[PDB]
Amino acid sequence: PSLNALVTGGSRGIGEAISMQLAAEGYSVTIASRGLEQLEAVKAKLPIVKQGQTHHVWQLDLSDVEAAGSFKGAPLPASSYDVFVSNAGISQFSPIAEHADADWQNMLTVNLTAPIALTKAVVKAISDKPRQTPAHIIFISTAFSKRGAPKVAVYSASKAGIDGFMRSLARELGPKGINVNCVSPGLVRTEMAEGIDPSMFDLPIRGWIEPDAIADAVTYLVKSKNVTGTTLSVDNGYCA
Amino acid sequence: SPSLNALVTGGSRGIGEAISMQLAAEGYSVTIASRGLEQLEAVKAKLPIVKQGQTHHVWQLDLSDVEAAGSFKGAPLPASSYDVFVSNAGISQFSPIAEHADADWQNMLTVNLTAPIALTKAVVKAISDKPRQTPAHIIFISTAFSKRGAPKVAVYSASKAGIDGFMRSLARELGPKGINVNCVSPGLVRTEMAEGIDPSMFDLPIRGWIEPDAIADAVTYLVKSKNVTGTTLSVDNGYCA
Amino acid sequence: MTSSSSPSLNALVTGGSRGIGEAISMQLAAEGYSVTIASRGLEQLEAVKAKLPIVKQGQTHHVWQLDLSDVEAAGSFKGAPLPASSYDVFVSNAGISQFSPIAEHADADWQNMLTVNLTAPIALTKAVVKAISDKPRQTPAHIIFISTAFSKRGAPKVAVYSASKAGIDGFMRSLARELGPKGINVNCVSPGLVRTEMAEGIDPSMFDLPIRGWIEPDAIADAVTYLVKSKNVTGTTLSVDNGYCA
Amino acid sequence: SPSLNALVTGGSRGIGEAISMQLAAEGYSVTIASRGLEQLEAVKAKLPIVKQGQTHHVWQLDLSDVEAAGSFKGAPLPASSYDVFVSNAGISQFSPIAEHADADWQNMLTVNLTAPIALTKAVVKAISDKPRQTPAHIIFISTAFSKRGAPKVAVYSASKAGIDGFMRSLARELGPKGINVNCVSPGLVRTEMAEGIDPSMFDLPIRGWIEPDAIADAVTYLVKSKNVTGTTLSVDNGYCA
């Protein structure tokens, strides 16, 4: 039977790479994002490999914390999902002093407040249901949230808060058959790079990290049942 | 031979009280900030004066107004006056995240992380380019639960781990600008934090409550230091061990 | 699509004759690696060798009787079926556990555990790193240490055990940095409590694990397979510990 | 006002000296242990006396000799005496692992890890069951390289990460017996680091070398604390930030 996976920020880059690999592993993938034009493009490319495997669009504004919390516009209930990948992701590069309040508070809503809400809703729905395999809550964090860089203060903070969430949730929901983990990318070839670039950091492993490599980690986790409370750093040796 | 100014959010009781006292005992001109003006004046009255030039202040500030925190609405002093800012204001809520009231945790998020970001920005916008013999100190009070997860305290841990994150980046951004940035991470301390939860309920290497004074010892040590930045001091009875 | 020569890569697994070792070898073998399994006990070695899949042309497995308490032997690749320069993957799983209040902990015991867990794998790694440092490659080599969750969250009565694997962690981070520009990715998989890798008076029930019970050795191998296929992961620990370090 | 006994290995030079000095400045009876005998007398001569019946002492010792450390061979006091032990026994070696001579990195391993384990085991043996008002302190000196990877320091890093694992475990083990166990993690410090590696090679939030005194600060703070165990105290100019 085709398990249901929710992947926020599934429109592009890492979320796409994730949604694809999950579809490829027989999962029914709901992607959630602002861009509908974009969702549909991506919906058609998701492999259908297992019979009964349907995919879904969710148009969702990632800064709407009541909508996320109330599953406003979701094609399926929160009770459905056996997997939730929190990849909702905006990054902003400014010195704290220059960093506009509209920006960093929006970032901090999108990267953390909405995820919490969305997570709450899911965990409410799926805690008491039976299952032989654990269900999976997996947050896409960032390398930056463990080792500090200049000019990514509020960004780092939003995703260190995520790391803190997962750690506690992992201990809270482990007896409920819910595994909770982060995957922590380093610098990836995407739309999370304006000024900032690999070269500006002396990496043990030079160059960009591709999305599909971030996905591999998600795929590994989803398939696991002994991994909770952990971060899987795919960061070319950034935090080493 | 001057008296430097210290700002200390949540200075009206508990950890922030113990810190403010010790700071004032070391000759800082402590401003305390919090919601309840009556409780403020009582601690201001309590703060020691051991130095001509030393002069303590109160700041009525609601911790959940970010415009207010951000702008310095109500401040005794200028932002640039501060050589030491201790972000100690926090809210703690024990709940299975399934029945965690939206308004409670969103509010706790604001108090714990959002507002301190805005306030921390004001202070940094002000004190960045200032000259100074020795370095300026931003010190957040996080919590042990930010580092080792615990059940039924997700959003709490999130907010304070969020702080840990902020401070790591800031330590890196503001090192050259002469500001050191660190966290002190208290465990269970004898205050009005959450409640119901006893030191019995975890397997602590050191049994018992932590006394708020002990936390202040960490802040005092940090503020007296030069080469410490990006670090958490854990005073947690070995909880994170 | 096709090729007239696709090569089998050489993997070395120390402590590969039972438990986690056994599991990893199995999994690397089924992925197409020519597996050299190494440890003291030759019967068990051969026993597993015969079980290792062969799924590929030009894939052969090997056995190395190696006394892991022997630093010199580890360092000089003494008795090794192949030279150090053969290996694209090296998995240091050689390890011992011991339980004791520090005060009751016999000197000959803990000292031997240190050699086995830290000293000798340093020696072994040096030999590999020297022999493969400057060999050209498009895909990275993998050095993987199997560590333990006790290296990162303290527990009573595993003092020298934790030190030893913690030393392996501090080793791994330094090398990841060192050898990353030489196309060598260096990592730790960190097992929590798994069946027959601890023994003698420590078990999951003594700890409030988010996930109760022992860990099957296959779970550890899943991590090691994942790493070995990875290209952008170095200087990290992958915890498989039923939530112990959380 | 009784003078408590403190053992400090590698107490003669650099960070050792600073630690020893500040301990004695606070009233502790110090035993500095090292191989160089003129250095011991030198430093012993300079240790402050501030407390009635405060006495200092030396113990000439090869910190590469694990049997001698383990048996307290030659020590001027029994293990039972000491309420404080600071394991600053240390050696750094910069080299490519491929080029790192067997004899060397194993001798480093012995001094950094093996010997302080034997030394720690001896202390814990002889003060585990003893009855105290304040907890005793076992404090290891580590390095920042033990938590952040840097090239050409693989075994140095490793050896001190061993010390990190050791103290975390021991904290959990001995907390209930009123032993607190932590590490102070120094970054790059004047005179302690093997020539070939220096602060300019890292984008430290704070530029430069660190004075040993700043290490001895973190120690002095731990020694006087009561609710801190299983922790690392980084004085590392933010290397690990």
Residue numbers in the entry:
A (entry chain D): 7 to 246
B (entry chain C), D (entry chain B): 6 to 246
C (entry chain A): 1 to 246
Kindly provide excerpts from the paper associated with this entry:
A large subset of alcohol dehydrogenases belongs to the family of short-chain reductases/dehydrogenases (SDRs). One such enzyme is ADHA, an alcohol dehydrogenase from Candida magnoliae DSMZ 70638. This enzyme was isolated for its ability to reduce several ketones with excellent enantioselectivities. ADHA is a homotetramer as typically observed in most SDRs.
